[PDB]
Amino acid sequence: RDNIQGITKPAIRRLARRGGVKRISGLIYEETRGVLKVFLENVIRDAVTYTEHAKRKTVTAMDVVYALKRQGRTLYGFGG
Amino acid sequence: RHRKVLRDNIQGITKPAIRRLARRGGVKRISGLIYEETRGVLKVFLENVIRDAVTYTEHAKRKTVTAMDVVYALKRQGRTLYGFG
Amino acid sequence: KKPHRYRPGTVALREIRRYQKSTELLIRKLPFQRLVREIAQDFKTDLRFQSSAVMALQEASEAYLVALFEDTNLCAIHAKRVTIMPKDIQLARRIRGER
Amino acid sequence: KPHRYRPGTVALREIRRYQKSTELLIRKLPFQRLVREIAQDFKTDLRFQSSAVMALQEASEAYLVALFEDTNLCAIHAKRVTIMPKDIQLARRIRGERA
Amino acid sequence: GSRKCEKAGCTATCPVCFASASERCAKNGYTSRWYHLSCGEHFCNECFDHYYRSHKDGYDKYTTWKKIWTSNGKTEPSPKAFMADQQLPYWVQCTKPECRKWRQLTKEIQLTPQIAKTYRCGMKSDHCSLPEDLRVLEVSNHWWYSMLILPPLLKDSVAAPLLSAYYPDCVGMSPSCTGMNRYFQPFYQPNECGKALCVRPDVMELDELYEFPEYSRDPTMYLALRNLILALWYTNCKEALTPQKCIPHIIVRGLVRIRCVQEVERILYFMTRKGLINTGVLSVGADQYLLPKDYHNKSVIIIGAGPAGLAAARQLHNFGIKVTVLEAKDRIGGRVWDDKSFKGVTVGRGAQIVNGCINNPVALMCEQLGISMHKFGERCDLIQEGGRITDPTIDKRMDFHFNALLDVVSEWRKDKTQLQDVPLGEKIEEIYKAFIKESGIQFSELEGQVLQFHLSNLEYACGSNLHQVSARSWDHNEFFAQFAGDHTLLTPGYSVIIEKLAEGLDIQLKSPVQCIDYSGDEVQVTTTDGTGYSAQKVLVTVPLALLQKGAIQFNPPLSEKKMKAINSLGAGIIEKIALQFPYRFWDSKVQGADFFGHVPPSASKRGLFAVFYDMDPQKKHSVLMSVIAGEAVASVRTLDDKQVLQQCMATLRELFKEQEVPDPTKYFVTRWSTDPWIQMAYSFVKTGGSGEAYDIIAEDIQGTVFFAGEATNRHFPQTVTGAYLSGVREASKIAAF
Amino acid sequence: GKTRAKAKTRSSRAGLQFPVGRVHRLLRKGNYAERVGAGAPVYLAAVLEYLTAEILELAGNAARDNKKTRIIPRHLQLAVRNDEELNKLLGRVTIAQGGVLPNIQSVLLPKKT
Amino acid sequence: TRSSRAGLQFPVGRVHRLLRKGNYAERVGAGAPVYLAAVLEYLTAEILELAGNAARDNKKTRIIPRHLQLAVRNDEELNKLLGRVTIAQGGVLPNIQSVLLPKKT
Amino acid sequence: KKRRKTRKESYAIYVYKVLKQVHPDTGISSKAMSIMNSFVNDVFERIAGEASRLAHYNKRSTITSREIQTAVRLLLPGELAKHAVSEGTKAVTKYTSA
Amino acid sequence: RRKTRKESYAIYVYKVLKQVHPDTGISSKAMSIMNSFVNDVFERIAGEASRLAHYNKRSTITSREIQTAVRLLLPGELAKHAVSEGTKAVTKYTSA
Amino acid sequence: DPHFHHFLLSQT
Amino acid sequence: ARTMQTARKSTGGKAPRKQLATKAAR
DNA sequence: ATCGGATGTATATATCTGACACGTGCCTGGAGACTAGGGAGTAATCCCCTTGGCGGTTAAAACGCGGGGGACAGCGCGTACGTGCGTTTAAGCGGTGCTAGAGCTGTCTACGACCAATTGAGCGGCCTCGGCACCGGGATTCTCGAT
DNA sequence: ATCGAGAATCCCGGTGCCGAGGCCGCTCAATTGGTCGTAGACAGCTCTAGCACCGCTTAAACGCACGTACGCGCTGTCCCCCGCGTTTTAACCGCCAAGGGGATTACTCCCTAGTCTCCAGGCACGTGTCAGATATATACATCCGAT
Ligand SMILES: Cc1cc2nc3c(=O)[nH]c(=O)nc-3n(C[C@H](O)[C@H](O)[C@H](O)COP(=O)(O)OP(=O)(O)OC[C@H]3O[C@@H](n4cnc5c(N)ncnc54)[C@H](O)[C@@H]3O)c2cc1C
Ligand SMILES: [Zn+2]
Ligand SMILES: [Zn+2]
Ligand SMILES: [Zn+2]
């Protein structure tokens, strides 16, 4: 239940702490779940498109490293 | 020659010309030191673009830069520009 | 005797030294995994994931959010503010071209 | 009875014109001499087709124009209506221009 | 599951679910958790999940509502809020007189004002005989509200359309919701400059917190009911607003509606007593009294039947309080006195202008009477003797300088105390001379004469030569929010309002009070002919001048403090002349303007007919009115009416030099100065004086002797409105006892 | 002994107006795959015909709606930049003699009454 | 070992396969995989060198991806080659904006 | 003056034909025609390259219409993907029926 | 039955690490990151060789195209030493 | 702020 | 008082204008 | 502006444990030695299209001079969120079970290059006029300084 | 508060002219029609790795109080930049000259695909350490009052 809300307010605090953000306002967390939601919607949509084309029921990691490469967000450490 | 000296090497982009580009961009009021920095930014952009374009002109061993040269070198920098090829 | 406490910002700045200093993955793996599956159910149903792919989407989540707080933080500092606000998030997203 | 409209009527009306028009602004021979001058550094004694000079003119105006779009959003996000050079530095840094 | 409630201290020994939304609803049985809305209202964990959980059927309905509640409100959309706003059954009270039982409506029924207005038990055996749900009584326990989770939010409030600028839930209305007299603007709008008789929709006033302390923590319910009440009053100001009329317009789900209905009566009576509603010329008779029998036992003598005395008398009478009015003259009205003998027009010998109609009691009373006022235009040409209209540039130049002089006065006074006060006139003069000295600029004789006009206009306003009026305090009242909007000519005259206020009251004419004795158990009042009156309380509304003259013997005597305040104010004076003509000789030159100015030939003569008023806004009849102010009031005291008329006609023939002027065929000249029971026009602050004087004079003595009148209203001195409001003020004070 | 047998070309065969042979040659001669299938440039010519029809359609609507009878590249500028999705396909592409679609920020508009 | 025919330590034949079997040209010349192998050995060499010194600064012996993170992001040119590339388990350089530094007396 | 030139290609008569289909009585200028020409080339190498590496991932060596369907469902944003796939299947089947 | 395989660069990356700081090891995540790094640069340079050969009406990738494409990708100083090592390996190759 | 208060509701 | 003026109102000498800034405002 | 709890953080020392550097075996892809058609270096020419100069006009740029409004420092006042402590609570762990589907390997087959003759189709040269500029005159609208 | 110079902007009308559109030859790339090895759909196994489930500990998440400091609106004060007349001045334009270099066509020829076999390089696969996390106890570095 409430998969999105599962991104905790301390987790968004922690990512802001790694980013070098001192103080966090009120409605930051709603928009943060929204932005993360949009980004994962695009990446998952393109990964599913990469996975239906091989006609395979299982999404692998090379699928999504390819999908991150194509959106100009290349990520090493999983092959390819 | 009647005057017409260098006076301004890379300052051709007169102050009203940078005003005209900014007002195409939708900019109301322009501060004072904007113009020198604007010449600097334009200089950096052209240095990269024709540094990359002159290499395309050198690889064909040709001494004349063409339009396909700079459209290709603009494409490679992710700034693709139609209307020339 | 009862004060001890700290300023609002010592725990913040020391916390920036720690969480900039360390590297590990820090959104919890089962809520994140359920989140990726529930977003994944919309485009197609009855899915299966490798685990390292969920790690990979976790890396894209931390990279994209963390970099968005880099640029959002420079946005709000450029307003002579030390506290980010949602219009700054909206600004850096428009500047990167995310609309 | 001489009386100028105001600081802003020439501005906003002239924004309506120079947004509304289409042609290329900065003049042909100083820009052409500029491209040849920067061109002399990487190689001596070059030659240009004229349309390629128009091409560098077009991409150069479009990159500067987009830079003023974004630095305008920057300075408006400071509750200012005037471009200042640190805003230019911000958008070059936020976008990623700042090497 | 359990049978117990989450809330600590809840007396619900058997929670049942009101929602029954989930096919899995627990009803009266076991559930993992009972969610509490009030002591009598709960919903089970299943129905909670039905809306709260994404995989449940009621989630859509809850997310949509959650969105509207976001584009519309400032409170967090919780499931409990959704429940109280969307699912809680309505309750309505049976209207059968001998029943009056409260009934729960079935969950699909949407309560409306029409349903509430006529509802009886059973409206879809003796349905009225079925016992009332035991939960209803509970609502009238003070702790009941304390265990309400969220405050009531009204639906479709009559106040709503007047408050579209506020977050509905900040003024007691629900975010999920949605031809008045233009002068009715009871609620402050966000970011508004002050204006008279406005209330904040979102904040309780000081007197309100005083009367209803239990709302200081959360004023939500009060504000909603108060705002509704005002909206209803202004929607129809021609009838007494009663609880019966309000109740149908209170729409909110849940048992809380019962608590709202129970509170409306308390707030209604407070609003009535204070004079916010059920006021003006509204008349109410035996068995229609506006306040409970609890206020009725008491008695009052009101001295003076002008706007102040009649306001208080009208209020007290309508309240059900025993009132007798003693008036010195052979007529009521005081400084309201209209001449109805002029052809097709009513001309005030006294007051006739309304200064700022927005929220003005006078505007309300015109509404109640179906009277139309004429709004003055702005134009007022400055015409010279003889003929010349003043050049627009000269006009603007001297207006600017005149007001610049006032600016520096206001700057000079900032650090001066009453002990350092100097006359406004003297101060202006000095500043003027010292300016011509400083800057070599020199004004023409005409420019100087135009300045004199403006000075004259100040003297008219204060009812005094400027060398008598305080530089520090002349405009003291503007510290407080003033009446905004149109200035109008009350064309039918103030007398219509006066008549209406007095109609049916116990008023004794030709009964000048001479003695007031409040040393015994009740006040003994004796007239000049020895006639005795007595009552528990007495209100004096006699003019400032009469207090200054000491025409009434007080025992015990007024305090030294009061006497100092009384003497620190000036009994200001102006006189009026009205002239009737055979035809409208001024139309060519004046061109429809409501008035025209008269440039003074000299400083000494400046207050001699400075402004002429066209007394027919329909431009059909030919009556002019003018005023005598400042020094000129003195110059006229030994002249008979004919002589004053001669000087006015001489003035007009000068102002209209290049044309002929017909003889007047009828006229009057007022002598307020020498009317024994009045002796003035309106108060002002004399040099050395403070606005606080108005408050001090206003102060009751031992809750036994009360004071009203224009000279007791610090916010709104001088005016019929101000006098009227001082009477309403005192009626409230007297009725509280 | 004949190579005639009704000449039905390729474009028509599919009911389009794009060169299947020229696009097909361009798929084989850019080293994209060692083998190129049967009906691939049929599909791809269909996609490009749809896209061409969309952009020229919106430049036609804007072409009447700014009172000309001829598409100029300015109409391609504000033709493309007004649909959301065509802009998202072309968001990194400058088109020459395009200019800027008229955008004015809210703080620049005058603070009148 | 055509690496030994050229004096390098990269697979000329495997890279040569990968140039021929990616459909780049129709045909690939002789000297080219020698060239590309030399370039990649250069880039590999200094990136592992900066991970070498910046690995010794953590007093370790095994380079972990943190050392590749700041080893890339410290030099300008390696950062500009890799400015769009996320490294998994990398983190960030300790950048702190100067207005956040708590000042006082 | 009198010498062989150099055969050349384009798309311009095809763009003119689709202009005849959409708004049949409406002109087009020359630089706009070169804009559309470079547009068709730009999209053409976009989905051609997406077909290249999208066919390279699955250890294939052949570009068929399923690959172009996937690659159009990667570059075309949403509503623009769907009608492109409907016209694409209509042209594959409408081709295949002969 | 055993199982297939799939090449890497890990032995070669290990060898250059032995050239530079020889008594200092490497961890496995960093090894796979270096692996996908050199695949990334390999596809950038081979791709630029494709786009550069696809302009001059030529269908052959010799070393000179790799010289130009390296002089377009790598910025400045490491382009100089990269191309200089490339001439060292072409000339050091063919002089043998 | 005394300025704005409603006259009939500030008589304490 | 100044408030008695209808025709040709004086304007000078007025204290600064106060403006209600409530939070209940949308 | 100094001093001390204190307190989070840097500094040896063991310790298990396991991830990596390494030794054994294998098999297939690197390579080595030929051939062959063709891609491309290399010459020479055609001409054209870039560069250069020079005079005549002048739109634009430069520059001086009001002046006001926009940046910005101070400053007071609200509120919201960082800090820290008691409560919970479900995430991690860690084992256990089940089988769906990735992956392998083999089967059989419909399909893309190879040539190779056949041809109209798009393209360049070359007309030709109508739509956009484009002055040129003229009523509308909006702004800005007045009431 | 609301109303006129007046200046910029929009609405028709002849002109012109030239760039958009169309027409006539015409080389060559599409087209059609067969083959052919082969890439790939297709079947089936396998086993392994993903999914499911259950109990325990607990770090982490949640939630209440609280206070101060961060946001933000008002105030003043300066100046830098906007606006507009005046000079100048160099850009724009037409045309005239010269040739250096792009495009072309041909010529010759070295060179890199293509084949077949040969073998060791790397790569799968056990293996056992020495590098690091993890306590674990221990003395500094700087924070935060309180002086
Ligand atoms: C010429 C003139 C022009 C004015 N213009 C305006 C105007 O344009 N607009 C406006 O709003 N106002 C105007 N005013 C002022 C306005 O009329 C007064 O402010 C208002 O009438 C005062 O109200 P009042 O009730 O306090 O007193 P009053 O009207 O003065 O009445 C007091 C009553 O007390 C009575 N009284 C006195 N002594 C005794 C006694 N001993 N025993 C019994 N009764 C006694 C008097 O007879 C009188 O009836 C004007 C007044 C005048 C005279
Ligand atoms: Zn229920
Ligand atoms: Zn309860
Ligand atoms: Zn009943």
TrEMBL record, chain F:
It is found in: Chromosome; Nucleus. InterPro entries: H2A/H2B/H3 (IPR007125), Histone-fold (IPR009072), Histone_H2A (IPR002119), Histone_H2A_C (IPR032454), Histone_H2A_CS (IPR032458). Gene3D superfamilies: Histone, subunit A. Residues 1-14 are annotated as: Disordered. The nucleosome is a histone octamer containing two molecules each of H2A, H2B, H3 and H4 assembled in one H3-H4 heterotetramer and two H2A-H2B heterodimers. The octamer wraps approximately 147 bp of DNA. Core component of nucleosome. Nucleosomes wrap and compact DNA into chromatin, limiting DNA accessibility to the cellular machineries which require DNA as a template. Histones thereby play a central role in transcription regulation, DNA repair, DNA replication and chromosomal stability. DNA accessibility is regulated via a complex set of post-translational modifications of histones, also called histone code, and nucleosome remodeling. This is Histone H2A. It comes from Xenopus laevis.
Automatic annotation (TrEMBL), chain G:
Keywords: Acetylation, Chromosome, DNA-binding, Isopeptide bond, Nucleosome core, Nucleus, Phosphoprotein, Ubl conjugation. Residues 76-105 form the Histone H2A C-terminal domain. It is found in: Chromosome; Nucleus. Its main location: nucleus. Coiled coil: none annotated. GO terms for cellular component: nucleosome; nucleus. The keyword Metal-binding does not apply. The keyword Coiled coil does not apply. Residues 1-73 form the Core Histone H2A/H2B/H3 domain. GO terms for molecular function: DNA binding; protein heterodimerization activity; structural constituent of chromatin. GO terms for biological process: heterochromatin formation. The nucleosome is a histone octamer containing two molecules each of H2A, H2B, H3 and H4 assembled in one H3-H4 heterotetramer and two H2A-H2B heterodimers. The octamer wraps approximately 147 bp of DNA. Core component of nucleosome. Nucleosomes wrap and compact DNA into chromatin, limiting DNA accessibility to the cellular machineries which require DNA as a template. Histones thereby play a central role in transcription regulation, DNA repair, DNA replication and chromosomal stability. DNA accessibility is regulated via a complex set of post-translational modifications of histones, also called histone code, and nucleosome remodeling. Belongs to the histone H2A family. This is Histone H2A.
TrEMBL record, chain K:
Transmembrane segments: none annotated. Residues 1-26 are annotated as: Disordered. It comes from the Eukaryota. The modification Phosphothreonine is found at T3. It is found in: Chromosome; Nucleus. Belongs to the histone H3 family. The nucleosome is a histone octamer containing two molecules each of H2A, H2B, H3 and H4 assembled in one H3-H4 heterotetramer and two H2A-H2B heterodimers. The octamer wraps approximately 147 bp of DNA. This is Histone H3. It comes from Xenopus laevis. The gene is LOC121398065. The chain holds residues 2 to 27 of 136 of the full protein.
